[PDB]
Prior knowledge:
This is CAP-Gly domain-containing linker protein 4. The chain is mostly beta strands.
Amino acid sequence: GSSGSSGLPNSDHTTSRAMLTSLGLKLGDRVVIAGQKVGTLRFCGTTEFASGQWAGIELDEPEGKNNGSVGRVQYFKCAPKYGIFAPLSKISKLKDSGPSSG
Length: 102
């Protein structure tokens, strides 16, 4: 680990409990990144490369900028150029989306 870098203890303090229930997503559900990209939710929480709430989604087609793992840190397993990560806050449940008016 690293004492002087980010802040507050590690492991503990997880914000991945009051998000899945509030939003309505779970491991094994079809989500949508920004109501555009369609993928299957596999991992949900924080990332090691970036900062904030993310999720390791797995697109059905080869349109991802990863292969399940990011550099040295691993999240989920999948084919090459299939796994991708996007802001959970930006990832919502499939369907029920459409501003229309703008």
